[model samples]
Target: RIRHEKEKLLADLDWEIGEIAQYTPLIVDFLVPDDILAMAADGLTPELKEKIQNEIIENHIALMALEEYSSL
Candidate 1:
C-alpha cells in the first residue's frame, strides 16, 4: 500500500507532483478534487499541473492533509 501525506502550502500555490514518496511508484496517484474530475489530466500531455494549480488557488479548494495511492 502507498500512503501520501499532503502538506499545506503557505502564501503560495506552487506544488510539484515529484513530491510524491519515492518509495512508491508514481504511475497513478491521488489529487484533490474541487467539484472537478479526479482523473485523466495526465492523458492530454499538456501542463495539467498548472491548470490544477490555478483552480486550487483561485477557487480556494482546501485539500486535506491525507491522500491515497494505488495501482491498476
Candidate 2:
C-alpha cells in the first residue's frame, strides 16, 4: 500500500511537469520535451532534494520576462 501511494505521488508530480512543458513554447521559441526533463533534473541535487518540498521548474533565463512575471 505504501509503494502504491508513492507511485501515485510520483505520477502526480510528473503530470505537473507535463502541464508546464505544455506552456514552454511561450517561453522557449524552440523548446524540446527532452530538454525540459534534462533542465529540471539538473536542479535536483543532494543539497535541495530532501529539504525542498515544493520544487519549481524553470527554463533558461530571461531577465526582463522574469521581472514581468514577478510583478504580475
Candidate 3:
C-alpha cells in the first residue's frame, strides 16, 4: 500500500513538472512595473514567481533520491 501511494505521488510530481515546464516560458518575460505588486501574467507576484521556481527546482533535485527510494 505504501509503495502504491509513493508511486502515485511520483506520478503526480511528473505531471506537475510538465505543467511547470509549459509555464516556464513566461519566466524570462515576466515584468513588474515600479511599485507594482504583481506581474502582468496572471497577476503573479514576484514572491510567487520565486516560489514557483524554487518548487520546480526542488522537485527535480529530489527526483534522484525518489528514484532510489522507489528501487527499494
List the candidate 1 regions with Cα displacement exceeding 4 Å: 1-31, 34-45, 61-72
Poorest lDDT segment (10 consecutive residues) of candidate 3: 31-40
Best by TM-score: 3
How well is each residue in 1-72 modelled by candidate 2, as lDDT tens digits?
433332333344443555444443433332223433343354554544323223323322343467689899
* Whole-model lDDT values for every prediction: 0.35, 0.38, 0.40
TM-score of each: 0.29, 0.22, 0.30
- lDDT leader: 3
Instruction: Rank candidates by lDDT, best first.
Output: 3, 2, 1
Q: How much does candidate 1 score in TM-score?
A: 0.29
Candidate 3 per-residue C-alpha lDDT over 1-72 given as tens digits, one digit per residue, 9 for 90 to 100: 433333333234344545444433233123111222222235543566565445545655565477689999
Total backbone clashes of candidate 2, pairs 3 or more residues apart or in separate chains: 0
Off by over 4 Å in 3: 1-42, 68-72
Comparing 1 and 3 by lDDT, which wins? 3
Model 1, 1-72: lDDT tens per residue? 222222222112345545532323222133434233333223421555566556555433322322222221
